[PDB]
């Protein structure tokens, strides 16, 4: 792997060697790479028309809908050329048939710009919008007119005409099904009632079609039906509508459904009660004002009263509904607190039912996501002792939800953070930093970082819990998100007193923090760790130094800062590679010059006798080859396989580099 590996893929596709494309991926690297014009090897392969390249590029796992600087997709390039048997291979594996660029045109906008035949047949079968125009204002049917070719434009307007007919047949059927919701025949009513609800179970656009047909007022009136079977199916339909976007939720609200749903919370029929809770929970998944409409309808006292229900299944639904309400802003969260939910929620944390336990943890987690006085209300209700006890639960999902609730509480002020510490949470949190579950690892790491962002007393309690050795050890985790959050935690701890800052460095963190900063790219953090005493020449078990990393990643600023602090310019890893090797292989010209300026060995050979000229000549880095020769690179050096840099440029097809080498020899 390397920036050398995915170098000629870009021009192998633009040329058209199935073989060279094949060997460029054979070892395994980046299937879709970068480009000056944001392109990928899939784009140029479909532009030139090499079918043997677009198919091999996706069977290994790439991306069919890659965008450039203008938004062009492989489908957009497969339609400008007119290649059919290259279009459907993209349509087969999920490609944007209506993908939009910065121009606004579509593949069928440009398929009719040149007037292409059979490629329009397959995009229309896959649902290509012919009615959506670009930003110029000329539809695909219109661009075929201006081109002077009305061959497939007739097929464009028929599909558009058939699209207009089918959308009006749907509106005709939907309106008649809504009419049948008023039928005195209950069989005809339920047949229409189930049909509409089933349609409303589909996508968000099918929900809008049911709304646009005027079904909501009839469904709300059916909520007072004496037929409980009709009432249940009407609840099911409204619940399906309320599962869509916020606009569809608001239409259910504006239809006056909430007062009927609140009243249905007192139903003795537990199936109807479960459906009403279903509908209210979906409405409370909306925005803050839609959650408030549920509150203003008086749903909270019934929900809090449902928390004492003997039916454990109904109890899970009421918890689900309360959890969504508490997902709103502080005004909505405070309404749940004022309704008296916290005493019942804390009591439910002692339930032997693990499913009720998770649903109760969710509600507390969202209530604890509010302001400091809302968090304090959770603390005052006695949730912390139960939450800490749940950290020793064998169920990893209950453990993950308890960590989430503790993280939300620890996001408040120092008084709330100190309450978490006083409940004995830090030992369990520090112990969970050794969990094999990586999701539990991050959740415990999130909680510690919020605690570590408190006062010096809260920082000191984190240190006294033995967090520093485990946090330092997490800096070497393969997960970079864990490295970053453990870095943030150690930075918050370092922002305390000078003694606390010294304890982070006596734990040996500067060695691994410098390694992280050398890979990420921001040089001021590299300056920070160096200034604070990080050894610039410390190598890994592989012998990789910070100067190796930035040269491999291409961070010129970090490379210069490290060299200014006495970094060994010719440091070797266990393979004999110097930073000059890594920069000449990845193709970073400026870094190669800076290293040579600071005395990097131009003719250093690794274990297998590879010199930097071998890597640059192998990878097509023409400018780097020229720079190496200026500094006295040996043109006649041979690796252990008897290959000169001129030989490697020939075995890779880099004729421009081969010409320079054969005459510089």
């Amino acid at each position: 792997g390397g920036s050398c590996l995915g170098k000629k893929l870009l021009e192998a596709a633009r040329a058209g060697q199935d073989d060279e494309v094949r060997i460029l991926l054979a070892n395994g690297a980046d299937v879709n790479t970068a480009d000056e014009t944001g392109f990928t090897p899939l784009h140029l392969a479909a532009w030139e028309g090499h079918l043997g390249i677009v198919e091999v590029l996706l069977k290994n796992g790439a991306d069919v809908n890659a965008n450039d600087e203008r938004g062009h997709t492989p489908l957009h390039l497969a339609a400008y050329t007119g290649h059919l048997e290259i279009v459907e291979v993209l349509l087969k594996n999920g490609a944007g048939v209506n993908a939009t660029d910065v121009i606004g045109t579509a593949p069928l906008h440009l398929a009719a710009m040149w007037g292409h035949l059979e490629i329009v047949e397959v995009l229309l079968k896959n649902g290509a919008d012919p009615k959506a125009q670009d930003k110029f204002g000329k539809t695909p049917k219109d661009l075929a007119k201006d081109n002077g070719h009305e061959d497939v434009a007739k097929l464009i307007d028929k599909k558009a005409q058939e699209e207009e007919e089918e959308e009006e047949k749907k509106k005709k059927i939907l309106k008649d099904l809504v009419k049948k919701l008023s039928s005195p025949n209950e069989n005809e009513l339920q047949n229409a009632l189930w049909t509409l609800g089933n349609i409303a179970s589909g996508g968000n656009e099918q929900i809008q079609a049911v709304i646009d047909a005027g079904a909501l007022p009839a469904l709300v009136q059916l909520l007072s039906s004496p037929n409980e079977q009709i009432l249940q199916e009407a609840l099911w339909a409204l619940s399906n509508i309320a599962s869509g976007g916020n606009e569809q939720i608001q239409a259910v609200i504006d239809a006056g459904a909430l007062p009927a749903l609140v009243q249905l919370l007192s139903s003795p029929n537990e199936q109807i009660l479960q459906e009403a809770l279903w509908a209210l929970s979906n409405i409370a998944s909306g925005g803050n004002e839609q959650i408030q409409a549920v509150i203003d309808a008086g749903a909270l006292p019934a929900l809090v009263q449902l928390l004492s229900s003997p039916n454990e299944q109904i109890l899970q639904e009421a918890l689900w509904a309360l959890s969504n309400i508490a997902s709103g802003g502080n005004e909505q969260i405070q309404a749940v607190i004022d309704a008296g939910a916290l005493p019942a929620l804390v009591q439910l944390l002692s339930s032997p039912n693990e499913q009720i336990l998770q649903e109760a943890l969710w509600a507390l987690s969202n209530i604890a996501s509010g302001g400091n006085e809302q968090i304090q209300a959770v603390i005052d209700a006695g949730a912390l002792p139960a939450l800490v006890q749940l950290l020793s639960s064998p169920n990893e999902q209950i453990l993950q939800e308890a960590l989430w609730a503790l993280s939300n509480i620890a996001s408040g002020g120092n008084e709330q953070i100190q309450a978490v510490i006083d409940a004995g949470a830090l030992p369990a949190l520090v112990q969970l930093l050794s969990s094999p579950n990586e999701q539990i690892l991050q959740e415990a790491l999130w909680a510690l970082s919020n605690i570590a962002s408190g006062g010096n007393e809260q920082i000191q309690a984190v240190i006294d819990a033995g967090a520093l050795p485990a946090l330092v050890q997490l800096l070497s985790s393969p997960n970079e998100q864990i490295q970053d959050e453990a870095e943030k935690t150690l930075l918050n701890i370092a922002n305390g007193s000078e003694e606390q800052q010294k304890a982070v460095y006596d734990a040996g963190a500067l060695k691994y923090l410098l390694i992280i900063a050398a890979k990420r790219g921001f040089a001021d953090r590299v300056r920070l760790y160096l200034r604070l005493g990080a050894d610039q020449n410390t190598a890994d078990e592989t012998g990789f130094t910070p100067l190796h990393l930035a040269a491999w990643e291409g961070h010129l600023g970090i490379v210069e800062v490290l060299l200014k602090n006495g970094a060994d310019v010719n440091a070797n890893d266990e393979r004999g590679h110097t930073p000059l090797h890594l920069a000449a292989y990845t193709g970073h010209l400026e870094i190669v010059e800076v290293l040579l300026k600071n005395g990097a060995g131009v003719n250093a050979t690794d274990v297998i006798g590879t010199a930097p000229l071998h890597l640059a000549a192998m990878c097509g880095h023409l400018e780097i080859v020229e720079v190496l020769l200026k500094n006295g690179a040996d043109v006649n050096a041979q690796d252990k396989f008897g290959k000169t840099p001129f030989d490697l440029a020939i075995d890779n097809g880099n004729e421009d580099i081969a010409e320079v080498l054969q005459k510089a020899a």
Binding site: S243, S281, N282, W320, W362, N366, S411, G412
Partner: peptide, 10 residues
């Protein structure tokens, strides 16, 4: 600080 809210549709 890190105040995360979670919604669930059904």
């Amino acid at each position: 600080k890190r105040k995360r809210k979670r919604k669930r549709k059904r």
